C-alpha cells in the first residue's frame, strides 16, 4: 500500500505537470497570464503616450505600435504632444516598448500553445513592427535601435530572456511620403523586430505577464475610455492606470501564485516515484499546487467579487468584442475587452478541480503515509 500510494503520486504528478486541458495547475497558470494580457486589451486603447526617446515632451512625434489593441484599430497610436511623460501623464515610449515587447511575446506564445509545466525548453519566434513619423521623432533612430542606416539598415544581436540566449534581428526601412504605396502621404520609419528562440514555458511567460502588469502599475499613465451605448459601463471614465488598484493587485497575486505553483514542479521532478522524505516532498508539493490553483480560481471568480471589480471582470475582462479568432488575436474591436479566454479558462480551471477529487484524496492519503514514515 506504500507502493500503491507511490503509483498514485506518479499518476497525479503526470495529471498536474504533463497534462494541460485537465490540469488544475496548467489552467491556473493560463488564467494568470490571460488575466494580465486581458487587462491591457481592456485599457490599452484608453492610455495616452508620446514623447521622444528620452521621455521628453515632443511637439511632432507620433509613434505607432502594430498588433496592439487600439481604438478602432490594430495599432496603438502614441501621439500625445507637448507634455512630458510621467505619472498621471502620457506613458513614455521607453515604457511602451517594454510593455509592447512583453505583449507581443505573450500573444505569440499563447497563440502557439503554452506547453505543460514539465515541458520547459520550448521556444517560439516573435516578430513585431512599429512606426515613427514626425520631424523630431528619434524613436526609430540609431540611438534607440542599434541600426546604422535608418534607410534599410539591419542588425543582428544576441540578448537574454529568462536566462536564455535569443537572437534578435532588427531592421529599419524609411518610407518616403512620395512612396508608391504610402497613403498616409507622410514620411515614416518602420522598425521590425524578430526574436528567434524566445522561451515559451509557464515560467517565462509568467515573467512576461509580470513585466506587462508591472510596467503599467509603475508608469501609471493617464487614460480616458469611452463606454459602449449598451451593456456594462465603466465609471469614472478618466484617471490613472494604477488607480485600478484591485484589478492590479489580483492580477499580481495570481502571477505570484502561478509562480509559486511553477516552483512546486521542480520538487516533483526532483522526487519521481528513508525514501520517505522524497515521498513527502512530492506529496506536499502536489497538495500545494492544488491549493494554489484553487486560490487563483477564487481570486478572479465573479461570485467572490463585488461591485466595480466584479463589473470589470464580468463585463470587460472576461469577454471578447472581436467580430463573429484563436488565443493571440488582435482586431479593430479587441479594445475594451479581454480577448484572452478568461471566461473559458476560469470555467476549465474550476472543472479540472471538480474532476480532481479522487486525486486530491490519493495525494492526501500518501501525505500521511509519507509523513508517518518520516517520523
Amino acid at each position, epitope marked *: 500500500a506504500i507502493n500503491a500510494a507511490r503509483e498514485n503520486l506518479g499518476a497525479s504528478a503526470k495529471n498536474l505537470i504533463g497534462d494541460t486541458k485537465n490540469s488544475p495547475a496548467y489552467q491556473a497558470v493560463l488564467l494568470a497570464i490571460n488575466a494580465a494580457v486581458g487587462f491591457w486589451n481592456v485599457l490599452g*486603447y*484608453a*492610455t*495616452q*503616450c508620446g514623447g521622444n526617446a528620452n521621455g521628453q515632451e515632443s*511637439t*511632432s512625434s*507620433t509613434t505607432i505600435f502594430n498588433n496592439e489593441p*487600439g*481604438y*478602432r*484599430s490594430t495599432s*496603438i*497610436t*502614441c*501621439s*500625445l*504632444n*507637448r*507634455y512630458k511623460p510621467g505619472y498621471y501623464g502620457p506613458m513614455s515610449i521607453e515604457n511602451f516598448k517594454k510593455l509592447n515587447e512583453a505583449y507581443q511575446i505573450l500573444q505569440t506564445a499563447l497563440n502557439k500553445g503554452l506547453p505543460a509545466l514539465k515541458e520547459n525548453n520550448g521556444t517560439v519566434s516573435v516578430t513585431y513592427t512599429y512606426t515613427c513619423s*514626425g*520631424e523630431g521623432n528619434d524613436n526609430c533612430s540609431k540611438k534607440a535601435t542599434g541600426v546604422s542606416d535608418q534607410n534599410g539598415g539591419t542588425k543582428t544581436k544576441t540578448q537574454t530572456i529568462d536566462g536564455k540566449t535569443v537572437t534578435t534581428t532588427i531592421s529599419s526601412k524609411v518610407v518616403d511620403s512620395q512612396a508608391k504605396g504610402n497613403t498616409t502621404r*507622410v514620411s515614416y520609419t518602420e522598425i521590425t523586430n524578430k526574436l528567434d528562440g524566445v522561451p515559451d514555458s509557464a515560467q517565462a511567460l509568467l515573467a512576461q505577464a509580470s513585466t506587462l502588469i508591472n510596467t503599467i502599475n509603475t508608469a501609471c499613465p*493617464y487614460f*480616458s475610455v*469611452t463606454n459602449k451605448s449598451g451593456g456594462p459601463q465603466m465609471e469614472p471614465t*478618466r484617471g490613472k492606470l494604477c488607480g485600478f488598484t484591485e484589478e492590479i493587485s489580483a492580477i499580481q497575486k495570481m502571477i505570484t501564485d502561478a509562480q509559486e505553483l511553477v516552483n512546486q514542479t521542480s520538487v516533483i521532478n526532483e522526487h519521481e516515484q528513508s525514501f520517505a522524505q522524497g515521498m513527502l516532498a512530492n506529496a506536499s508539493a502536489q497538495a500545494k499546487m492544488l491549493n494554489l490553483a484553487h486560490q487563483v480560481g477564487q481570486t478572479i471568480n465573479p461570485d467572490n467579487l463585488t461591485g466595480t471589480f466584479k463589473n470589470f471582470v464580468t463585463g470587460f475582462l472576461a469577454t471578447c468584442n472581436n467580430k463573429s479568432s484563436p488565443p493571440g488575436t488582435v482586431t479593430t474591436q479587441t479594445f475594451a475587452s479581454g480577448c484572452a479566454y478568461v471566461e473559458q479558462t476560469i470555467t476549465n480551471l474550476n472543472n479540472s478541480i471538480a474532476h480532481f477529487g479522487t486525486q486530491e484524496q490519493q495525494i492526501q492519503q500518501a501525505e500521511n503515509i509519507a509523513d508517518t514514515l518520516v517520523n
Partner: nanobody
Amino acid sequence: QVQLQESGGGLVQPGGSLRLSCAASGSIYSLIAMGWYRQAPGKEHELVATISSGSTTYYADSVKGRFTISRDNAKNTLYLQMNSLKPEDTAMYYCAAYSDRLTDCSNCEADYWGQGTQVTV
C-alpha cells in the same frame, strides 16, 4: 491616440481667401476642444481659433471678423475659413486638439497636433 492631418494650404493674393481642412482620427471621444495655431518663421506660435464641444468659439483678436472655425462632426473634420488675407497671415498653420486630461486647465495648450500646412499671402 489622436491623429490630425491638415490640407488646403497654398499661395494666395492679398484680399483673397482659403479654407483649411483637418481630418481627425483616433480617440475623438476624448477631445474637449479643437483649434488652429500658427507660427511664422520669425514669430512666436499663436493660437488662431478654437471650438469647444458645445460649439462655442474663440478667436484671436487679429483674425476675429476675418476667419471662421467650424467642424463637420459626421466626417470628423475641422475647417478654418480665412477671408481677406493680409501678408501678415503668412505662416505654418497647425490643426490641434485638447484631450480631456486638460479639462480643469483653461490655459493649457493643446496636447495633440498635426504636421502643419503652409499659407503664404
